[PDB]
Write an enzyme that holds these catalytic residues in place. Structure first.
Site, short mmCIF file in Angstrom:
data_model
loop_
_atom_site.label_atom_id
_atom_site.label_comp_id
_atom_site.label_asym_id
_atom_site.label_seq_id
_atom_site.Cartn_x
_atom_site.Cartn_y
_atom_site.Cartn_z
N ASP A 263 8.79 -4.07 -9.96
CA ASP A 263 7.33 -4.04 -9.97
C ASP A 263 6.93 -5.64 -10.38
OD1 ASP A 263 6.76 -1.73 -9.32
OD2 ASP A 263 6.51 -0.87 -11.27
N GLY B 263 0.82 -1.14 0.14
CA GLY B 263 -0.03 -0.16 0.07
C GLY B 263 0.80 1.23 0.02
N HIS C 271 9.45 -4.89 -2.20
CA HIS C 271 9.17 -4.11 -3.46
C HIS C 271 9.57 -2.54 -3.12
CE1 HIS C 271 6.05 -1.76 -5.92
NE2 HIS C 271 7.02 -2.28 -6.92
#
Ligand SMILES: [Li+]
Lengths: 121, 121
Positions: free
Chosen positions: A89, A29, A47
């Site tokens: 990603d 998030g 990430h």
């Protein structure tokens, strides 16, 4: 960019990326990092650390090219920063898919809950 | 913070913010901006553009004071950023309420990877 990220997430996981990962545990998030809650959360940690390693390009804004040939993400040449962005990603899309088995909706939040400090990236 | 924002949305729209607007369309929630699907989504686009104009406070994390007086959101911060933030949030809550008429529950968890590029703010 968010565009490529969201898409890769959906292509890999089959899940609505915002709904499933836009507010999940401590790392999935938009609320920085925190001690991962589970494997899925852990993807999001890696990430976010992947992003820290980039130099100059904007992980949220900067578009890059990738192909989805044979339902695998291949990051286009791009430039090094954009290629690495893309790889970040792609990595998190793949990891999220990989960890769908233990994905647990109880880690989704509206407002972010308790998260110990993540190790520095 | 998402706490004040969500409180405002609830007060203005009378809907659960997270459910109704947490992932609505191309602009409400986590995927940055995309081209607004409709008026509700365009509130969220404007809200995101509003957040871009803020200097030195954090919309996600920073608390701020506001009052709900005669069913009106009244921002009460001395701090210029938190006051501006509060106003961004008030503005989106009011906008969302104003466009409840076109709220498309099918956009509620819209798949943001479908969104076209947003215009710049
Ligand atoms: Li007003």
């Amino acid at each position: 960019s968010l565009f490529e990220l969201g898409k890769m997430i959906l292509q890999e996981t089959g899940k609505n990326p915002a709904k499933s990962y836009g507010a999940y545990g401590c790392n999935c998030g938009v609320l920085g990092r925190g001690k991962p809650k589970d494997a899925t959360d852990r993807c999001c940690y890696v990430h976010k650390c992947c992003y820290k390693k980039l130099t100059g390009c904007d992980p949220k804004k900067d578009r890059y090219s990738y192909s989805w040939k044979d339902k695998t993400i291949v990051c286009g040449e791009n430039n090094p920063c954009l290629k690495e962005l893309c790889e970040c990603d792609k990595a998190v899309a793949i990891c999220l898919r990989e960890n769908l088995g233990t994905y647990n909706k109880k880690y989704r939040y509206h407002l972010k809950p308790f998260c110990k400090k993540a190790d520095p990236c």
